[PDB]
Ligand binder design. Sequence first.
Ligand SMILES: [Mg+2]
Ligand SMILES: [Mg+2]
Ligand SMILES: [Mg+2]
Ligand SMILES: [Mg+2]
Ligand SMILES: [Mg+2]
Ligand SMILES: [Mg+2]
Ligand SMILES: [Mg+2]
Ligand SMILES: [Mg+2]
Ligand SMILES: [Mg+2]
Ligand SMILES: [Mg+2]
Ligand SMILES: [Mg+2]
Ligand SMILES: [Mg+2]
Ligand SMILES: [Mg+2]
Ligand SMILES: [Mg+2]
Ligand SMILES: [Mg+2]
Ligand SMILES: [Mg+2]
Ligand SMILES: [Mg+2]
Ligand SMILES: [Mg+2]
Ligand SMILES: [Mg+2]
Ligand SMILES: [Mg+2]
Ligand SMILES: [Mg+2]
Ligand SMILES: [Mg+2]
Ligand SMILES: [Zn+2]
Lengths: 38, 160, 196, 249, 119
Amino acid sequence: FKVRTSVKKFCSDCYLVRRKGRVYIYCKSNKKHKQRQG
Amino acid sequence: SQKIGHSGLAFARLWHHVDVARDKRTLGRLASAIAITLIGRHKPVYHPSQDCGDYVVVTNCQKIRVTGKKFEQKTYWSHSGRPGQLKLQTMNKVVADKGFGEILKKAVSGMLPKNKLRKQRLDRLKVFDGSENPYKQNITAFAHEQSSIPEPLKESIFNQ
Amino acid sequence: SQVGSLPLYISPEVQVSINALSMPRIIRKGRTSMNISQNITVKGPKGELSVEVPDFLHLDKDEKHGKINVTVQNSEDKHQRSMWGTVRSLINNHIIGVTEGHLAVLRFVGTGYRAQLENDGKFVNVKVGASIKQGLDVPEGIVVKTPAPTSLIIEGCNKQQVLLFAAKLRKFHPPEPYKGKGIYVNDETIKLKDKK
Amino acid sequence: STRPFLVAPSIANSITTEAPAINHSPELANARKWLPKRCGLITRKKGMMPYFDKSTGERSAATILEVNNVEVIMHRTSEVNGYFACQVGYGSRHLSKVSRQMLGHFASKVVNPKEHVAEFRVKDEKGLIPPGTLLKPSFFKEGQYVDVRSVSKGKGFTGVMKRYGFKGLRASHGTSIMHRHGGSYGQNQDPGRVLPGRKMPGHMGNEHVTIQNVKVLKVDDENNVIWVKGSVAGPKNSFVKIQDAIKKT
Amino acid sequence: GGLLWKIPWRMSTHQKTRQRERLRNVDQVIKQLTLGLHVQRCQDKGLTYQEAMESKKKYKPRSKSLRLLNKPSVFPKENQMSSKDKYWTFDKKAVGYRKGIHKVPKWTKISIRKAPKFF
RNA sequence: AGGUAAAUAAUCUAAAGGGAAACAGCCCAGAUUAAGAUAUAAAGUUCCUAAUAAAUAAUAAGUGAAAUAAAUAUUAAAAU
RNA sequence: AAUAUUUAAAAUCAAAUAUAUAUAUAUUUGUUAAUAGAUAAUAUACGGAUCUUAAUAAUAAGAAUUAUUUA
RNA sequence: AGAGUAGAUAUUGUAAGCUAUGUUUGCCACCUUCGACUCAACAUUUCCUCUUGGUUGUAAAAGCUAAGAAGGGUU
RNA sequence: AAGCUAAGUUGAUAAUAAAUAAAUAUUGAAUACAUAUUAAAUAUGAAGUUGUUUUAAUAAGAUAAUUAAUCUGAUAAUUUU
Ligand SMILES: [Mg+2]
Ligand SMILES: [Mg+2]
Ligand SMILES: [Mg+2]
Ligand SMILES: [Mg+2]
Ligand SMILES: [Mg+2]
Ligand SMILES: [Mg+2]
Ligand SMILES: [Mg+2]
Ligand SMILES: [Mg+2]
Ligand SMILES: [Mg+2]
Ligand SMILES: [Mg+2]
Ligand SMILES: [Mg+2]
Ligand SMILES: [Mg+2]
Ligand SMILES: [Mg+2]
Ligand SMILES: [Mg+2]
Ligand SMILES: [Mg+2]
Ligand SMILES: [Mg+2]
Ligand SMILES: [Mg+2]
Ligand SMILES: [Mg+2]
Ligand SMILES: [Mg+2]
Ligand SMILES: [Mg+2]
Ligand SMILES: [Mg+2]
Ligand SMILES: [Mg+2]
Ligand SMILES: [Zn+2]
């Protein structure tokens, strides 16, 4: 997980999710693309 | 001239029921309503120098309305004086410990005026999570109201 | 909306009823609310199971062609519309389970990686590289069977419950990337890394 | 025939609902508690002496806890008292010493005027012993573990060196008039006050002390004593509770 | 800023209503001034007070300041004014180039209707 | 910079009273002595605390509720 | 539905006022929100309580927030 | 931007941009003692211990980096 | 010698349990896909939290006795646990 203020989806296989009052970006292909909005 | 007469009934401490299951007010609004009663602002004979407020029995307090996510967010604080002893409990935790009646009492305490009579006023509030309570028999009642109530229920209440 | 509008086909053996609950409960959001009153049931050959559902939703049972429909009192209400697509899908899943039955194959991959039915079906013992023994009890409704030691099958009427159980079983050892090695639920895949 | 009474509609027409159970109830607390499944007995710490294990040859210091007229006076129950416990009484006392009220209580419970009374809390109703019975050292098995409560030796008004193991100031190198003192007792203004529980000189000892998992070395009903491995809090002739160890089985 | 001038950045509802009322009062004052002048001029020409009040053609004020006040482009009425200009002054050093009117000193007396065209 | 230097206005200085939780300088308003019926100012009107009812929108974050924290990010919403 | 901007009453339209007046001219007004970003040391700190609504069911509650208003 | 055998975002992150802190060196002028010993209390921006995400740069083992975490400990 | 002591001796680092954090899932719409839910349902998850354990305080409750030839205390004496 890259925890950061900015949370953009990198590849096409990335998908944005809204859980626990935080924007997560998970990804099905590349595991490096996992991000979390703060 | 207006003051002269028998004042015993005016200064009589009545007992006021409130079935929280029936009442549609939220917690804080209910507490505010109670506070006035406890003070005795409702009655025209009131004076700031004299405690002349009524008893308030709250019942079925488990069914009290709380808006938003306050039941799992709202934190009740406490502190002895020794540092590193701040005790913060969420509303649900407080309920689990004591009850919804405790929560109501806290609200009512905060509503009340901060002086030597405050404690007395708080004491007069009698809260109950469920239905059954000892003060059942002493809530204000009238003979004209009796036709509304069925026959055996009254007897059962009296027995209780 | 697009999901909820799709009509559900029923075979004579299965019956989709609906009726009010004994003690309806109300889900209270911040602004909106949602009162769970009705209780749909899907009785069939393999078993029977139910869905507790809001008041605004209601079925529309047709005698001709075995179709039934589901509709809400206000489709323009967002929460209702969201519920509608869910409920229909749930009752379809139930129908599928009662008539055919839901299935979940777990294939174990690794040297000495295998499952075993320990308590006459009631406890799936799983051995997946651990000194301590691992496993968990099968829930009610779920029936487990092991064609091979390294290939377990979970079977049930509830699609939710079976696949949850499968996921739990997997969680002891999910597939590693370096060697495709672990517990694979149904058609599960993994991109194997280069060895180097 | 019937008495006059009015009843409010609001209290009569109120739908009946039971209150939810609260954590700060007695019954919840009882459920939570970590308790022994069996009663205990009061004893007196008579002294201390060596126990030689005859197989191995190992020596162990053992305290001799004497068991005299130990008797289940009465017991308490959840429905009446909020918890299960056995009120045990130890020893024999004169009439002269015992209060009239206490004598009457003992007569009611049908025991001799007792030297020391104490409760022994248990998990269940099964743990209660029938009242009036005599508890002997054979109650406990040899090799079993027991928890041991008693009031410690009184040490009097002690300093922070003896109380809290404070290092104190140096013996030489200029140190003036404060060799055994606690040094600083706070902080300049921020707090502006010595904060509660600041370790200071005060009275020490003469407080209760539970000692957990002590092994029952030896039991004999002939001399009326339980041998117990190691130390026990308090002076000689001090009363000592003994119950099964909750931690060790 | 150790001294605490605890003034809120925005106004309450009641404050806003009072401001509105004040604005309305100044417009009323202006109207009265123009009206009285008109009446006086009618009297000079030779009408009674009632006749002057009735008159279809109302006389506009000849003095400059009054005439400017009458113009809504220069001095707008409360009903004419924007929501923003009732409750927000122009302040070039503020972010947004805007500041609450309540932050102006003596705002209860001092009038300020017109802000710049795009600020 | 609660800094420094002057320009204009006000207050404090030398100004009590109401408001701004508490407050030299802010918002009102100038105590000759009382009285307390009527108009009120600024500020307020669930309770503490003197006094409230409505309308139409928006928020669900306790955001906020008298001391507004930025670039940027995400999710919506309108208009083209 | 998709792509890409803008978040605007300058223009434009709508509504209102004032001059000849069923029209013209001039003036005035009307164009997003939420969350994250967010953060230290005696103790929660809107001044405090507390405020976000709910049919069945009340001679009865339903912001006490923000914005535009009324009495 | 640029390093990272290839790929800016595993790890690294020039100069310029937007903030927080009041831990340093200053500035202001309302206001006229460093270290050691002793006992420490509090914070968390976590050094160790517990849980977890990422790591063509996680095979293993050692690491690196990030999220939760102040219970205990930290010559 | 007693006592007091640590260089000595003995014990404890307080479980089981409950709800959680980051994180990991199930079914599943809104949004024909997808999505662990900032939807309804359903699960995992920490030396942390609640507790548990220990000490001190308090005294709801409980047993008994109730104007006393020896009711309950105190003053007094001999003392130390
Ligand atoms: Mg020394
Ligand atoms: Mg000396
Ligand atoms: Mg000092
Ligand atoms: Mg002077
Ligand atoms: Mg003057
Ligand atoms: Mg003054
Ligand atoms: Mg004067
Ligand atoms: Mg707030
Ligand atoms: Mg603030
Ligand atoms: Mg224009
Ligand atoms: Mg704080
Ligand atoms: Mg306030
Ligand atoms: Mg390059
Ligand atoms: Mg740089
Ligand atoms: Mg941290
Ligand atoms: Mg490794
Ligand atoms: Mg703990
Ligand atoms: Mg040792
Ligand atoms: Mg432990
Ligand atoms: Mg789907
Ligand atoms: Mg999925
Ligand atoms: Mg744990
Ligand atoms: Zn991706």
